[PDB]
Amino acid sequence: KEPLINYLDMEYFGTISIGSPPQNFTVIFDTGSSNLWVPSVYCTSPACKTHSRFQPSQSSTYSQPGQSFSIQYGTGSLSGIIGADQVSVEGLTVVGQQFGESVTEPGQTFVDAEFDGILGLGYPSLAVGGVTPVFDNMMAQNLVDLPMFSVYMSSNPGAGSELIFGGYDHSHFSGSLNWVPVTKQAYWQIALDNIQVGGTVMFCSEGCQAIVDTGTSLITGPSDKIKQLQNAIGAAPVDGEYAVECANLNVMPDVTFTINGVPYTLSPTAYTLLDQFCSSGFQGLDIHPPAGPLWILGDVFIRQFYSVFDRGNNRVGLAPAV
Amino acid sequence: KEPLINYLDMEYFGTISIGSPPQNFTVIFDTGSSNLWVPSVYCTSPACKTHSRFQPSQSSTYSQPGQSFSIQYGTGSLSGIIGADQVSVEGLTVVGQQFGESVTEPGQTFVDAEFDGILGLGYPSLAVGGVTPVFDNMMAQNLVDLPMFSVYMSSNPGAGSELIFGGYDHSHFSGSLNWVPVTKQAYWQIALDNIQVGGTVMFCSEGCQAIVDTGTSLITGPSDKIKQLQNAIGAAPVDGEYAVECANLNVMPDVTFTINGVPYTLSPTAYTLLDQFCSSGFQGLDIHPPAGPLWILGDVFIRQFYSVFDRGNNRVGLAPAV
Amino acid sequence: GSLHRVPLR
Amino acid sequence: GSLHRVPLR
Amino acid sequence: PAMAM
Amino acid sequence: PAMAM
C-alpha cells in the first residue's frame, strides 16, 4: 500500500527539530490532519533509509508515554509508538510534545518523498490516540499572542511562502479578511453556498461541505462532480492527469466558490498548473461518509487566497493573496 | 514467513536482564547461533504484543552503536537495530553488550512462543554485523574462571536443568569427559566417524559433519537419511511427526553416534519422546551448502550426554549425564 | 505582538 | 573457582 | 521586564 | 582482599 500517496505530490515544506540536541526533519504543515509524526530510526524499510529518522537515545529530553499509535490517511495505515520530547518550530519550542515515531512500511514511493513527516494543524478530535496537537500545546503553553496561525503560499517564482503562528501578515493580502465559521471541528471544515462555472451555478446549488487543507495540493471534490468540472473548463484525460491547451487559457471560464455569501473566483490562470504543459488544478477525491463527501480547497486555492485559521473563534479568514 | 519456526518446539528457557533498571526476558541459550536479540518495544506486530519488549528510554545505561541488523535462521529474516547496554545472566553482568532489538514481523506463531529472544553461544564468525557474542564479552571482561560453559538438560520430571558459565559440574555426569575437537569455528561443529543402528554402521560410514546445538529440540540430519533412520527404528509417519508404538520400545534398536572413536549410544528409551503417545526424537532438516549438510545433536542428545563447550581449547566435552 | 514565521518551500 | 549457574526450564 | 509587543 | 576460589 501507499499510506502517504496523497502527500507525494507538489507540497510546501518547512523544518522542525525534536530532542536535545535538535534532530531536524522536513515536514508538511497539514491542516487536514492533527498528528505530528516522523520516521523512527527503528523503521528499517528501504523507504525510510533515505529520510531523517528520529533517534530517541540521542535525545536527553525524550520520554515514552507508553502508548503505541496507528494513523490512516485513507490509503493504508502507518503505525509506530508515541514519544514525547521538545519540538521546535522557528522561534518557539513546545516541551513535552507527543508525536508518533513511525515504524511500519510507509510505502515504496515514500523513498523519494521530499518530506520526512507531517505536522497536523487540525482540531484534536482528528488526533489519533487522543494525542494533543502541536498548536494546541502552543496555545496551552501561551507561546502565541493570538489563538490562530495563517498560511501564505507563493505562486512565484514559492520563495516568500510562509506559515505564521500567533497571527497573520497583512502584507500578504489585500482588503479586509472575510470570516467563515467552522461547521465541524475536526478538519477546518466550512460550508459552500454553491460552486459556479462561467458565472453560473453548477454544483452544490443547495450548499455542501468543504475543508481548507494545506496538505492537499489541488482542489478536490467527489470524483463524479470533478469530471463534470473538468470538461466544463475544457480539460482532457491523459496518462492519469487532466491536461489543458495552454493557448485556450484566455477563452476558458472562471470557477467560483461562494463561501458565506462571498465569491471566491479562480481564473483559469489560477486553476491551471504550468508544471511546459498546462494541466488541471482540479482532481477527484472521494472522502467516505460519515466524514465525506467533501470538497477540498487545497494549495491551488490557498495560493489565490491567504488563509487564516482561528481556533479562538473557530473560523477561517480569507482574502486575495498578494 | 515463520523466521523462528525451528525454535517454537520444546525448548529450555532461562531468564536475563537488560538495562537499568533491569528489564527481564525469557531467552533460549543457543549454541547454534551467536547473536543476542529481544523484541523491541517498536515491534508493533500482533505477535510481539504478548512478549516482553525492550524499552530503551527506560534504561539509563542504553546507547545506540548506529548500525541496524538482520538475522536469518533459515526460514525468513528478522530485522531491527543494534543496541548496547548492560546484560545480566544470573550472577554476571556484561557492560556495553550489543544486541538486536527486533522490529519486523517475527511470525504469527511467535505469538504463543514461550520465549522472548535468543542468546547465541556459538562463535563470533556466526554473529551478524560483527557484533561480539555475550560469551566472548564474558571472556574479554574476565567474568569467567575458565573459557567454557556447560549444559545439563534434565529429562525428568526438567527441574534441575542448568547452564554453567565458567566451568562444569561433575555431579551431572559420570566418568571422565571425552573431548572432541571443533572442526569449523562457527557453530560448535564436530566430526562423526559413523552412525549405526542395531550395532551396524548405516550412515556416515566415511564420516560426516555435525554440530552440538542446544537450540535444536531433536536430533536432525539430511531429510533423506532420517527417513531411512525412521523406518529402521520402527517409526511411522502421522499428521506431520513420526510416531512409534510405545509397546515395542524394548524391541527397538540402539542408535549409536561414534564421535572421535567413542560410541554415544541412545537406547530407544532415550530417542523417543513421551510427550500418552510415543514419537520419534529424530527429524529431517536439510542445511544448505556450504554450511550443510549437517547432522544436529540437539536436546535429545544433550539430555543423554552432558555437554561442555570449551572456547579455550576449541573442543567439546561429552559424558553420560546423571 | 510577535509573529512566529515558518518559511515554506 | 566459582560456577555461574543459570537455571533452565 | 520590558512589556512585549 | 581475599583470594577467590
Side-chain angles (χ1 to χ4, degrees):
Chain A
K1 303 177 188 174
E2 295 277 29
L4 311 173
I5 193 177
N6 280 162
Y7 294 92
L8 303 188
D9 255 286
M10 42 175 63
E11 298 275 23
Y12 290 72
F13 313 105
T15 294
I16 70 168
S17 290
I18 308 178
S20 314
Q23 284 178 50
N24 304 312
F25 297 91
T26 297
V27 302
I28 298 173
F29 291 82
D30 182 31
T31 57
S33 66
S34 306
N35 295 87
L36 164 55
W37 68 263
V38 291
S40 170
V41 69
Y42 285 83
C43 172
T44 59
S45 167
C48 279
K49 289 162 189 170
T50 53
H51 293 81
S52 302
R53 303 186 297 295
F54 190 62
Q55 200 158 32
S57 67
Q58 291 303 308
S59 166
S60 53
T61 48
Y62 174 85
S63 76
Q64 235 169 54
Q67 54 243 48
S68 67
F69 88 88
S70 192
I71 61 180
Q72 247 279 54
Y73 290 115
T75 67
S77 61
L78 203 58
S79 305
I81 72 91
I82 295 295
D85 208 317
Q86 61 184 61
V87 175
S88 298
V89 185
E90 209 73 68
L92 301 177
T93 293
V94 179
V95 309
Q97 173 72 54
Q98 300 191 324
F99 56 99
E101 298 169 61
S102 70
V103 183
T104 64
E105 177 56 50
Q108 193 197 305
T109 48
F110 183 60
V111 77
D112 299 306
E114 292 194 293
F115 66 96
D116 301 307
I118 298 168
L119 191 158
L121 294 158
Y123 288 79
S125 73
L126 204 56
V128 304
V131 171
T132 304
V134 167
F135 192 57
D136 288 68
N137 279 320
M138 287 187 268
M139 288 191 273
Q141 284 172 31
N142 302 315
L143 300 182
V144 288
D145 295 348
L146 289 182
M148 51 182 237
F149 53 94
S150 51
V151 181
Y152 169 67
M153 297 181 157
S154 195
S155 57
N156 292 292
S161 295
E162 78 176 337
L163 171 79
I164 301 171
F165 283 115
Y168 58 72
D169 193 327
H170 208 315
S171 66
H172 289 309
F173 68 87
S174 66
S176 197
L177 286 174
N178 294 299
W179 294 106
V180 180
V182 166
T183 59
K184 183 186 168 183
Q185 289 163 43
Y187 303 112
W188 282 85
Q189 201 171 315
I190 58 169
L192 297 180
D193 293 313
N194 57 243
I195 300 170
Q196 51 190 60
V197 184
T200 295
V201 176
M202 189 172 293
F203 307 105
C204 297
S205 54
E206 307 175 65
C208 60
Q209 295 285 310
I211 69 179
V212 188
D213 180 18
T214 52
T216 293
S217 307
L218 312 180
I219 289 179
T220 67
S223 51
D224 58 340
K225 310 277 78 173
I226 296 298
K227 289 178 181 180
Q228 297 186 60
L229 180 51
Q230 298 288 31
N231 48 202
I233 61 175
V238 194
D239 294 303
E241 351 301 303
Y242 285 71
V244 304
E245 185 54 61
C246 298
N248 320 308
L249 200 60
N250 56 60
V251 70
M252 288 166 82
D254 285 351
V255 174
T256 292
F257 295 89
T258 304
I259 306 177
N260 202 33
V262 183
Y264 289 98
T265 300
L266 304 167
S267 57
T269 287
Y271 66 65
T272 298
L273 308 167
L274 296 183
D275 176 66
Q276 307 173 67
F277 306 71
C278 296
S279 57
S280 184
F282 298 110
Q283 184 185 70
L285 180 55
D286 303 296
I287 302 300
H288 302 313
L294 292 165
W295 278 80
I296 302 181
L297 304 183
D299 298 345
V300 168
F301 185 85
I302 300 170
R303 263 193 293 279
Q304 294 311 299
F305 302 99
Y306 184 69
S307 305
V308 179
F309 306 86
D310 178 2
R311 284 289 292 283
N313 302 295
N314 294 298
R315 57 183 185 171
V316 178
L318 306 167
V322 179
Chain B
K1 303 177 188 174
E2 295 277 29
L4 311 173
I5 193 177
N6 280 162
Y7 294 92
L8 303 188
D9 255 286
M10 42 175 63
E11 298 275 23
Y12 290 72
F13 313 105
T15 294
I16 70 168
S17 290
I18 308 178
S20 314
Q23 284 178 50
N24 304 312
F25 297 91
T26 297
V27 302
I28 298 173
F29 291 82
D30 182 31
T31 57
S33 66
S34 306
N35 295 87
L36 164 55
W37 68 263
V38 291
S40 170
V41 69
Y42 285 83
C43 172
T44 59
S45 167
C48 279
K49 289 162 189 170
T50 53
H51 293 81
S52 302
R53 303 186 297 295
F54 190 62
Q55 200 158 32
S57 67
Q58 291 303 308
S59 166
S60 53
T61 48
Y62 174 85
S63 76
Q64 235 169 54
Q67 54 243 48
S68 67
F69 88 88
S70 192
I71 61 180
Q72 247 279 54
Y73 290 115
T75 67
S77 61
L78 203 58
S79 305
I81 72 91
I82 295 295
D85 208 317
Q86 61 184 61
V87 175
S88 298
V89 185
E90 209 73 68
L92 301 177
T93 293
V94 179
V95 309
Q97 173 72 54
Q98 300 191 324
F99 56 99
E101 298 169 61
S102 70
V103 183
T104 64
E105 177 56 50
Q108 193 197 305
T109 48
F110 183 60
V111 77
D112 299 306
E114 292 194 293
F115 66 96
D116 301 307
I118 298 168
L119 191 158
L121 294 158
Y123 288 79
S125 73
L126 204 56
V128 304
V131 171
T132 304
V134 167
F135 192 57
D136 288 68
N137 279 320
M138 287 187 268
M139 288 191 273
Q141 284 172 31
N142 302 315
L143 300 182
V144 288
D145 295 348
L146 289 182
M148 51 182 237
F149 53 94
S150 51
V151 181
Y152 169 67
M153 297 181 157
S154 195
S155 57
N156 292 292
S161 295
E162 78 176 337
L163 171 79
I164 301 171
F165 283 115
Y168 58 72
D169 193 327
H170 208 315
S171 66
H172 289 309
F173 68 87
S174 66
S176 197
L177 286 174
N178 294 299
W179 294 106
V180 180
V182 166
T183 59
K184 183 186 168 183
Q185 289 163 43
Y187 303 112
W188 282 85
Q189 201 171 315
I190 58 169
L192 297 180
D193 293 313
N194 57 243
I195 300 170
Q196 51 190 60
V197 184
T200 295
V201 176
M202 189 172 293
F203 307 105
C204 297
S205 54
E206 307 175 65
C208 60
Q209 295 285 310
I211 69 179
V212 188
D213 180 18
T214 52
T216 293
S217 307
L218 312 180
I219 289 179
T220 67
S223 51
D224 58 340
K225 310 277 78 173
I226 296 298
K227 289 178 181 180
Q228 297 186 60
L229 180 51
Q230 298 288 31
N231 48 202
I233 61 175
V238 194
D239 294 303
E241 351 301 303
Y242 285 71
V244 304
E245 185 54 61
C246 298
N248 320 308
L249 200 60
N250 56 60
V251 70
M252 288 166 82
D254 285 351
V255 174
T256 292
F257 295 89
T258 304
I259 306 177
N260 202 33
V262 183
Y264 289 98
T265 300
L266 304 167
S267 57
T269 287
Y271 66 65
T272 298
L273 308 167
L274 296 183
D275 176 66
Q276 307 173 67
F277 306 71
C278 296
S279 57
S280 184
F282 298 110
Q283 184 185 70
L285 180 55
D286 303 296
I287 302 300
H288 302 313
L294 292 165
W295 278 80
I296 302 181
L297 304 183
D299 298 345
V300 168
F301 185 85
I302 300 170
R303 263 193 293 279
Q304 294 311 299
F305 302 99
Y306 184 69
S307 305
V308 179
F309 306 86
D310 178 2
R311 284 289 292 283
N313 302 295
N314 294 298
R315 57 183 185 171
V316 178
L318 306 167
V322 179
Chain C
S2 182
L3 295 182
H4 305 293
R5 306 162 184 277
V6 178
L8 307 174
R9 308 147 302 186
Chain D
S2 182
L3 295 182
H4 305 293
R5 306 162 184 277
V6 178
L8 307 174
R9 308 147 302 186
Chain E
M3 283 312 117
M5 178 68 257
Chain F
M3 283 312 117
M5 178 68 257

